[PDB]
Design a protein around this ligand. Structure first.
Ligand code: G0T
Ligand code: G0T
Ligand code: CL
Lengths: 149, 149
């Protein structure tokens, strides 16, 4: 579970926000892309896996699971690519809630930047630093450090 | 110590590679940009600080130290913006060596992608996972986790 991430794609302002959630901590990375292609998704995962020890990614949809470019990225980065079937129905609700939370934060910062990508990164910052009391950022580091040790 | 980062800018293929190094661990994040403007640098720092607990950034040059956009991002993200004067002359050699290491890795992967940005992210991955025996990625997590506890 320290190495398990879940992809999530949401929409805003006619653009796509691609999110990777670290399941055990709720920590996230996100980017704005024009559309969710296999190439965009592959590049995003390459970035993520160079930054955190990504063992497994539950893809966000069947097209990214199928994509040979995505599978090639997962091969490259040593990632086990898996489906995102919510065998635990709670997975669904957690992601849905996270998307609503993220959109709320983006609205709260939206006027502090011209470009959506800027607001999304501000939203990533606020989400990861929010104490719920540890933050998601604190949680992911402790989880992973415990695993190293 | 756990919160201190150093910016570093290097060039390849007529493009700019912007790097942030976590001083204590040698862990890096990097991006390819067309040119190193205050705005690009500001956006890069906002991204970094949403992802790791960035307390202090030593800027890579005087233009980024001066830039009001960069100062505004550091204000936004709660980052202490500092100069990058190598009061310890070893700082300067470490960065030069890091740039040469990264360019070497980029050369080793260059034929595995059309776009330089892809090769740079592959280089980030290889650099952070390389056991020197712990990796830079292991070290940053352990350093920050020790600080949390
Ligand atoms: C990480 O994924 C992979 C990493 C490595 C491989 C194995 N190598 C090859 O198959 C290969 C080799 C040589 C030339 C072209 C290719 C095929 N390419 C398509 C690889 C590629 C993918 C995503 C990208 C790329 C590029 C690129 O060639 O640079 O460029 C930037 C965009 C940016 C996001 C966007 O613009 O959508 O993401 C496959 C996937
Ligand atoms: C992160 O730094 C800051 C974040 C926030 C502030 C306070 N808010 C404002 O001053 C503000 C408010 C409203 C409209 C425009 C602005 C002024 N902007 C210039 C802010 C901005 C900076 C860098 C960017 C931006 C944008 C943007 O407006 O979205 O957009 C993407 C590019 C991507 C990199 C590149 O393309 O160079 O980086 C300052 C710096
Ligand atoms: Cl954080």
């Amino acid at each position: 579970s320290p190495g398990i991430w879940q992809l999530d794609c949401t929409h805003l302002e006619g653009k796509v926000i691609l999110v990777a959630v670290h399941v055990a901590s709720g920590y996230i990375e996100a980017e704005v892309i024009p559309a969710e292609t296999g190439q965009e998704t592959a590049y995003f995962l390459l970035k993520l896996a160079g930054r955190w020890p990504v063992k497994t990614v539950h893809t966000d949809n069947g097209s990214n699971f199928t994509s040979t470019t995505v599978k090639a990225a997962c091969w490259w980065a040593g990632i086990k690519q898996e489906d995102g079937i919510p065998y635990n129905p709670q997975s669904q609700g957690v992601i849905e809630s996270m998307n609503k939370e993220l959109k709320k934060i983006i609205g709260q910062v939206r006027d502090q930047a011209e470009h959506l990508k800027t607001a999304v990164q501000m939203a990533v910052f606020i989400h990861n630093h929010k104490r719920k009391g540890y933050s998601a950022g604190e949680r992911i580091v402790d989880i992973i450090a415990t695993d190293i040790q």
